[PDB]
Design an enzyme around this catalytic site. Structure first.
Site, PDB file in Angstrom:
ATOM      1  N   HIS A   1       7.013  -5.833  -1.394  1.00  0.00           N
ATOM      2  CA  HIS A   1       5.915  -6.770  -1.535  1.00  0.00           C
ATOM      3  C   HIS A   1       5.717  -7.118  -3.039  1.00  0.00           C
ATOM      4  O   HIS A   1       5.853  -6.244  -3.887  1.00  0.00           O
ATOM      5  CB  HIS A   1       4.646  -6.194  -0.921  1.00  0.00           C
ATOM      6  CG  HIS A   1       3.515  -7.170  -0.882  1.00  0.00           C
ATOM      7  ND1 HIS A   1       3.153  -7.854   0.269  1.00  0.00           N
ATOM      8  CD2 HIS A   1       2.672  -7.597  -1.859  1.00  0.00           C
ATOM      9  CE1 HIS A   1       2.129  -8.652  -0.003  1.00  0.00           C
ATOM     10  NE2 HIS A   1       1.825  -8.523  -1.286  1.00  0.00           N
TER      11      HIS A   1
ATOM     12  N   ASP B   1       0.792  -1.225   0.000  1.00  0.00           N
ATOM     13  CA  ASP B   1       0.000   0.000   0.000  1.00  0.00           C
ATOM     14  C   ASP B   1       0.832   1.288   0.000  1.00  0.00           C
ATOM     15  O   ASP B   1       1.592   1.554   0.957  1.00  0.00           O
ATOM     16  CB  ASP B   1      -0.933   0.014   1.213  1.00  0.00           C
ATOM     17  CG  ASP B   1      -1.859  -1.188   1.240  1.00  0.00           C
ATOM     18  OD1 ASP B   1      -2.209  -1.700   0.147  1.00  0.00           O
ATOM     19  OD2 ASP B   1      -2.228  -1.638   2.345  1.00  0.00           O
TER      20      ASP B   1
ATOM     21  N   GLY C   1       1.825 -11.643   6.574  1.00  0.00           N
ATOM     22  CA  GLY C   1       1.743 -13.100   6.738  1.00  0.00           C
ATOM     23  C   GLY C   1       3.076 -13.845   6.719  1.00  0.00           C
ATOM     24  O   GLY C   1       3.158 -14.954   7.284  1.00  0.00           O
TER      25      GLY C   1
HETATM   26  N1  LIG Z   1       7.448  -7.633   1.674  1.00  0.00           N
HETATM   27  C1  LIG Z   1       6.899  -8.835   1.414  1.00  0.00           C
HETATM   28  C2  LIG Z   1       5.642  -9.166   1.886  1.00  0.00           C
HETATM   29  C3  LIG Z   1       5.083 -10.400   1.554  1.00  0.00           C
HETATM   30  N2  LIG Z   1       5.788 -11.326   0.774  1.00  0.00           N
HETATM   31  C4  LIG Z   1       5.247 -12.637   0.384  1.00  0.00           C
HETATM   32  O1  LIG Z   1       3.791 -12.521   0.369  1.00  0.00           O
HETATM   33  C5  LIG Z   1       3.301 -13.611   1.174  1.00  0.00           C
HETATM   34  C6  LIG Z   1       1.955 -13.124   1.732  1.00  0.00           C
HETATM   35  O2  LIG Z   1       2.168 -11.952   2.565  1.00  0.00           O
HETATM   36  P1  LIG Z   1       0.875 -11.201   3.102  1.00  0.00           P
HETATM   37  O3  LIG Z   1      -0.146 -12.090   3.729  1.00  0.00           O
HETATM   38  O4  LIG Z   1       1.357 -10.032   3.935  1.00  0.00           O
HETATM   39  O5  LIG Z   1       0.297 -10.451   1.839  1.00  0.00           O
HETATM   40  C7  LIG Z   1       4.375 -13.717   2.273  1.00  0.00           C
HETATM   41  O6  LIG Z   1       4.286 -14.962   2.961  1.00  0.00           O
HETATM   42  C8  LIG Z   1       5.613 -13.670   1.418  1.00  0.00           C
HETATM   43  O7  LIG Z   1       5.838 -14.886   0.699  1.00  0.00           O
HETATM   44  C9  LIG Z   1       7.071 -10.989   0.307  1.00  0.00           C
HETATM   45  O8  LIG Z   1       7.719 -11.797  -0.368  1.00  0.00           O
HETATM   46  N3  LIG Z   1       7.596  -9.750   0.646  1.00  0.00           N
END
Ligand SMILES: Nc1ccn([C@@H]2O[C@H](COP(=O)(O)O)[C@@H](O)[C@H]2O)c(=O)n1
Ligand SMILES: Nc1ccn([C@@H]2O[C@H](COP(=O)(O)O)[C@@H](O)[C@H]2O)c(=O)n1
Lengths: 326, 326
Positions: A232, A210, A275
């Site tokens: 992300h 976001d 997550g």
């Molecule tokens: N900064 C981030 C946030 C999430 N992720 C990936 O996204 C997956 C899902 O994260 P969320 O539930 O926060 O959207 C995480 O387990 C991770 O594999 C990532 O690689 N880098």
């Protein structure tokens, strides 16, 4: 306040035009879904695209539609029949039982199994009845109402006999007595040969998808002295004053590869409740911290988030972002 | 005999890989559906595409998914909420009540209205019980079974109060007492100023979309002395010894424009039972003939086809194609 029109043939587009022309004071979004595209399809699509407030042409893969808008010949019937793959089993996310219900129904004899959509599976059914979600007319009420209906259909329609979860020791909304629960660990952290943390410390911030979290993220990096940001996968803006890690990997796979190469390095992962904190908590030499910026309302994250993090032994740090310049 | 896997996130693709690797002897078709694409999505998609017998990446328009695979923040909730169009009414083909059921259910307060899918709406419910469709295990039985189930759901779920048909004086399967039936004439043939057929005769064959009808079509053109072919919008091969009309129009719109320019020309339209015979029957200076090639089994077209054509006053000509050279 708009009208939707869904079409999958040229004559249906011509019906859509007649309906629109009889309602010249109304707003229309028109979607064409078609396995074919050529100048005839384009001609009529462009006519609609000229008259509608918004129009989209989904160009579908051949053979997705098992029925017929026209009366089929025996030959058309026979071709469709023997095009169709034989399906013994379907695996999908638990909430895709809702969004692709209609397709599941076309294989009633297929065995169905599900896997977690994501951390949404960790909110138990009772929490949607919490006070947090029971003020009428609120965005939070409507969210909970939507989720109660979707979990009900995911659990009770198109019987599926097994559910795969990637989260160890956390109760799943799909654990309802109607199916076998199977723990499926995504990440192998066994062959890393991690040793004592006798090297440096590497600090990585988990980027938020976001754009509004941009300033709070830059302040976190400054406050906690974090040199790197793992953006992300859905993240589309940059952070200033932090080095962005550019990689095809998600953070868990990136971190496994780093621990193996750097078995004495201390990795610290800072996150606004991603997550990834839950999938990584037990990685060796990985130390996860959730950050709770003081400038956000206490209810910016739903209460189940805080409970899941503390239940998982992940520290939650109050971060006074307003005490940090810029 | 294959397994299907449906994914909409990266972690779900990683679950799909683990499921596939545990079933090395099984066949897998994997579909990713995602609003995002970048090197992270591509990386994991390519991994699956390497391990699966077949894989497809549907790259969806942003905002189609109103739920969440992750636990949303108040800000994510608020953005989704106020992105969502307000929908007062949805128009779709009658059988799209089946295939897009799940989407309709997300607007329970929308008014729903339907229109004909095509000539499939002209087969009345009783005909699917005909002897033609009641041999068990046949392709014809399975077709009828599929159609009975789909019409039942189109008629009885997600109540829709009106149905638009483009066919005048032919009973619709959607005329079931649950809705208003509205005749919607697609084609305006009022302003053409057609006169007496005192010019030439123009003969056009309606192309079939099926490549197997190629030889029979060329023989029809020779037999009946047809100079032109109007290719079917889904038609993808050529006819030899006939001039193909190349046009963005479907045949009805093409023919209206021709009658206006050529008000004294006799147009004859020859067709292997195209639905265009039904929309065009009452055009001035247009004379339609259905062709029934003797070399095809009598049951190549379903019995309701013959009844609908003769009920519509369209002549059916037995054509002895085997009497025509080449
Ligand atoms: N900064 C981030 C946030 C999430 N992720 C990936 O996204 C997956 C899902 O994260 P969320 O539930 O926060 O959207 C995480 O387990 C991770 O594999 C990532 O690689 N880098
Ligand atoms: N040769 C053909 C056949 C059909 N068509 C168009 O396709 C529509 C549907 O025809 P069918 O039901 O045969 O598929 C016809 O009403 C006509 O508009 C065409 O333009 N040219």
């Amino acid at each position: 306040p708009v009208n939707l029109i869904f079409c999958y043939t040229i004559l249906q587009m011509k019906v859509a035009e007649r309906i629109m022309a009889q309602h010249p004071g109304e707003r229309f979004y028109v979607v064409l879904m078609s396995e074919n595209r050529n100048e005839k399809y384009d001609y009529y699509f462009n006519q609609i695209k000229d008259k509608a407030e918004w129009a989209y042409f989904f160009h579908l893969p051949y053979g997705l539609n098992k029925s017929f808008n026209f009366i089929p010949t025996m030959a058309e019937l026979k071709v469709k029949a023997m095009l169709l793959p034989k399906v013994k089993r379907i695996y999908l996310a638990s909430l895709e039982k809702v969004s692709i219900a209609a397709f599941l129904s076309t294989y009633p004899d297929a065995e169905i199994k599900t896997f977690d959509d994501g951390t949404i599976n960790l909110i138990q059914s009772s929490s949607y009845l919490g006070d947090e979600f029971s003020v009428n007319g609120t965005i939070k009420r409507n969210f909970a109402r939507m989720m109660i209906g979707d979990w009900s259909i995911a659990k009770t329609r198109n019987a599926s006999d097994e559910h795969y979860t990637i989260f160890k020791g956390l109760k799943n909304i799909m654990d309802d007595g109607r199916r076998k629960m199977t723990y499926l660990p995504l990440f192998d952290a066994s062959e890393l040969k991690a040793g004592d943390e006798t090297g440096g410390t590497v600090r990585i911030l988990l980027g938020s998808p976001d754009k509004e979290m941009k300033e709070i993220s830059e302040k976190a990096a400054k406050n906690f002295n974090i040199q790197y940001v793992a953006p992300h996968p859905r993240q589309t803006y940059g952070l200033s004053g932090v080095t962005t890690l550019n990689s095809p990997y998600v953070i868990e796979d990136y971190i496994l590869r780093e621990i193996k190469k750097n078995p004495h390095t201390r990795y610290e992962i800072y996150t606004f409740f991603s997550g990834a904190a839950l999938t990584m908590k037990d990685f060796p030499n990985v130390h996860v911290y959730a950050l709770k910026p003081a400038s956000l309302p206490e209810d910016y994250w739903l209460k189940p988030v805080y409970a899941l993090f503390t239940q998982s032994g992940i520290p939650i740090l109050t971060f006074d972002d307003k005490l940090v310049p810029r």
